């Protein structure tokens, strides 16, 4: 399938014999599913997100079918706000990010998909993140008015400054839209801008 990013990339998965809905998430190292019974043995782990750390149950070598594509790998079970398929399984199903329908660069998911952006006349490194609704950039003194906002993910919520109509060049591709500024651990390019550069998930 080729999946565009105007809506959250939610797909049905099969796991432990049950169906679940989950987000294909290039900005996640790992796969995190809401509390559930998983046949398997587990061990405690902590993982981090936009707003801090949570405790999860780590299950290894779990079969998961993602839109009909098979994977067998680590699945973390815990208090995530949305079920997420991260790179550990996206790589197993041969998922890549592609610009402009595949006419542009292809980015594999073996490592975090970090690319150079230009914003406010400044160059920064940011993660191309299909699991982000918004674009979140580390503290940077952007000019212009703004409005306070809170955005969530693993760990809860952080406060950010919302700036609209900010030009952002991504790997040489021009975009313009809302940028949220605040204490994110990693700079994130989310769907609001990935759609403007024609980025798709492909597998």
């Amino acid at each position: 399938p080729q999946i565009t990013l105007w809506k959250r990339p939610l797909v049905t998965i099969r796991i432990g014999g049950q169906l679940k809905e989950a987000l294909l998430d290039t900005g996640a190292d790992d796969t995190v599913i809401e509390e559930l019974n998983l046949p398997g043995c587990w061990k405690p782990k902590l993982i981090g997100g936009i707003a801090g750390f949570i405790k999860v149950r780590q299950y290894d070598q779990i079969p998961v079918e993602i839109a009909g594509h098979k994977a067998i790998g680590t699945v973390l079970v815990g208090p995530t706000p949305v079920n997420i398929i991260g790179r550990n399984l996206l790589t197993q199903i041969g998922a890549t990010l592609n610009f402009c329908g595949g006419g542009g660069p292809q980015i594999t998911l073996w490592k975090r998909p970090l690319v150079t952006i230009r914003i406010g006349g400044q160059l920064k490194e940011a993660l191309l993140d299909t699991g982000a609704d918004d674009t979140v950039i580390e503290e940077l003194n952007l000019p212009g008015c703004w409005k306070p906002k809170l955005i969530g993910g693993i760990x809860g919520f952080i406060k950010v400054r919302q700036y609209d109509q900010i030009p952002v060049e991504i790997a040489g591709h021009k975009a313009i839209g809302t940028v949220l500024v605040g204490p994110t651990p990693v700079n994130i390019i989310g769907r609001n801008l990935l759609t403007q550069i024609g980025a798709t998930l492909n597998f």
Binding site: D25, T26, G27, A28, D29, D30, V32, K45, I47, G48, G49, I50, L76, T80, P81, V82, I84, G86, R112, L127, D129, T130, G131, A132, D133, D134, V136, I151, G152, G153, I154, P185, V186, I188, G190
Partner: peptide, 6 residues
């Protein structure tokens, strides 16, 4: 493990 915004 770092894992991404809603």
């Amino acid at each position: 493990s770092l894992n991404x915004i809603x």
